Amino acid sequence: HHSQDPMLSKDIIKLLNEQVNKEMNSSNLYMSMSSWCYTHSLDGAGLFLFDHAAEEYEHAKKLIIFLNENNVPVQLTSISAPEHKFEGLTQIFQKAYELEQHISESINNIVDHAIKSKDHATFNFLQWYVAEQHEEEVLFKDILDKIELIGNENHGLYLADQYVKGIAKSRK
Template structure:
């Protein structure tokens, strides 16, 4: 059975992963509205990926004999200034999620919950990949730029990444 501290943190992480899925879906909608179909497709796929992260946590909690809870979710933002703004906010959000996962891992060590610690190693590695992915998108935007055909090229390249999510 999970200790109350760990269960509380896992349920909070479930809600955060669910929020992430909604955030990326809202960003996908904004991109679609801006005629950025590659970015919309990428962010929709990323939303599905975040939802699967939530389900993985949900299943783990239930398999321990505890009860996973779905908390109330805040409405994600749905207005953005540019495609760069979308991916800046995405990168910042992923760094926030990394900090939350790291705090959860720390709590597992403090509570000597090595089973949950082991389970969370996948998330630690996943967050490294997520931060790298979004940093590379921001780097691409900086290198290519968004003037003239740059926006078209950036969107096209981001769309190609939807197969890698």
């Protein structure tokens, strides 16, 4: 039996497949960061990072669904082993913010390419992912600002972790 060919172009397909893989690699990094937090008495950040990892996995799932609906093969490659050694809460969120910047940029690249290809079906699809990612990027900026404002004198780590715990619970 004959199945219709992929409804997207080759280049867009490769970009989307790679984006799936990035979100999965993010999801695992955030779980590793979360574990670091949980095993260094920072369960606030641990919870926050664990839930954020599931958001990133949710993005991968949504990209997959869009691939499936366009009859495009999802070609999953490996998910890299995440970094597991960290210096502290601040460094974790500094790395997290940098990652979220990289992810926003990776989406921009696909969106841009959609515009050049005049693939507006894909452009239109992504816009929801653009908006969501922007809010995530802003969130990590805010958390990082806050961790840095509090500092790590005496009870500062505890205060930071309680602040993040509040965000985790708010965003449920």
